[PDB]
Design a protein around this ligand. Structure first.
Ligand SMILES: OC[C@H]1O[C@H](O[C@H]2[C@H](O)[C@@H](O)[C@@H](O)O[C@@H]2CO)[C@H](O)[C@@H](O)[C@@H]1O
Length: 404
């Protein structure tokens, strides 16, 4: 019979690729359907380029793709409309904001799979050791705590110890980190939902100068090459006070054999001042049936399975990844394993989106401009004032003649 082939997630990031292959194989066994899993590179912008080769070719060689939350506007032509396959009641079991995000010109491009938000990981043992009772609420507090704890841990002989790690590589992850910096300084959304390109302002410029000031000081010089996993590995070895990352890192840091098991918590990222908005960049993954799949019925069935309550529960319990079904946030087993799912729910609900709705199919070009200009601040090439001006100009060229 048919072989249903899935491209989604990556074995290069934590357990997500291994787990996804396990889920697809479970579906195959349950239904008596042959399946194959095609692996992907770690970074989402690299995954997009890979998948675009198949789409450009109208290739039937992948039936189901795991797509980023920023992609529906780009990928819609390549997606089978799922709307006729789901009842209104089935669709209402997901968060309506995510179903909306996935709907482009009426086409339900994909089912919500897991959501995501940037959060602050912190070493509770170290905060206690150095006389701190709570994680930092402001970026200045974060800098002060990092400097003090670094001074102490270095003096004690840990030459590998840093204050803060994050994603500073030039790729989509840096657009996420930078939106959080900019938005948490009251600098706006880079491109506002209405289309206004707002980034050329002093709050945005200050946010980027602040981030530059961390590099080689409280963060490694090499942070300008870090994606999720490079940051995670410094952190998980016990060598960073703080880390910005996504929910997946939590289960991995709690695993048996992790040096930091039981030594950390999570909270909302800091902000410039008490009246700035909290920033958590919205992330996550959706499940798309290929427009070019020869087996739409079977592929839909697989996507419904992967998006089901029990599969999302397993993702939550074993991989600490955020459900797209509100009902799971009240499930006793999800909450006993990840109590912070409840504590941080309002942070996840108020997550700030990158400008993928307003940029639509041009989002990847906009993001590349963002991460390249931001990276130029991190590397010391430009100051934040020049970078936000240059970024404004670049995005204006990209979006000229584009309307949402
Ligand atoms: O790098 C930006 C990218 O980060 C997040 O995706 C992670 C996800 O959290 C991990 O579980 C795993 O799948 O790797 C991805 C990073 O490569 C966001 O979900 C995503 O929206 C964002 O673009």
């Amino acid at each position: 019979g048919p072989v249903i082939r899935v491209a989604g997630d990556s074995t290069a990031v934590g357990e997500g690729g291994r787990w996804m292959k396990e889920m697809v194989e479970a579906w195959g066994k349950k239904t008596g359907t042959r399946v194959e899993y095609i692996d992907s590179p770690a970074d989402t912008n690299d995954r997009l380029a890979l998948y675009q080769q198949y789409w450009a070719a109208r290739s039937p060689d992948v039936d189901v793709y795991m797509i980023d939350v920023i992609w529906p506007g780009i990928v819609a032509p390549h997606a089978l409309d799922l709307k006729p396959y789901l009842t209104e009641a089935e669709l209402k079991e997901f968060f309506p904001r995510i179903v909306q995000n996935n709907t482009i010109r009426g086409k339900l491009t994909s089912l919500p799979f897991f959501t995501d938000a940037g959060i602050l990981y912190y070493r509770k043992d170290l905060l206690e050791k150095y006389g701190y009772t709570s994680p930092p609420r402001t970026w200045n507090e974060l800098e002060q705590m990092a400097e003090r704890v670094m001074e102490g841990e270095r003096r004690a002989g840990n030459r590998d110890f840093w204050g803060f790690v994050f994603q500073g590589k030039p790729y989509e992850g840096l657009t996420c980190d930078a939106l959080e910096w900019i938005y948490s300084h009251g600098g706006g959304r880079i491109v506002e939902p209405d289309g206004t390109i707002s980034v050329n302002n002093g709050r945005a410029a200050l946010a980027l100068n602040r981030a530059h000031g961390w590099v080689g000081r409280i963060a490694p010089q090499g942070v300008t090459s870090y994606a999720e996993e490079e940051a995670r590995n410094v952190w998980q070895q016990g060598n960073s006070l703080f880390m910005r990352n996504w929910p997946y890192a939590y289960a991995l840091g709690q695993a048996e054999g992790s040096p930091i098991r039981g030594k950390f918590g999570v909270t909302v990222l800091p902000k410039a001042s008490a009246d700035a908005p909290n920033a958590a960049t919205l992330g996550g993954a959706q499940l798309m049936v290929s427009a070019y799949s020869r087996y739409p019925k079977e592929a839909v069935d697989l996507v419904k399975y992967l998006a089901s309550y029990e599969v999302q529960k397993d993702n939550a319990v074993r991989l600490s990844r955020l459900p797209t079904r509100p009902a799971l946030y009240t499930d006793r087993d999800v909450l006993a394993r990840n109590p912070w799912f409840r504590d941080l729910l309002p942070v996840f609900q108020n997550a700030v989106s990158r400008p993928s709705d307003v940029a639509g199919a041009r989002y990847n070009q906009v993001s590349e401009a963002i991460w390249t200009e931001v990276h130029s601040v991190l590397t010391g090439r430009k100051k934040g004032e020049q970078a936000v001006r240059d970024l404004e100009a670049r995005i204006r060229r990209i979006l000229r003649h584009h309307h949402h």
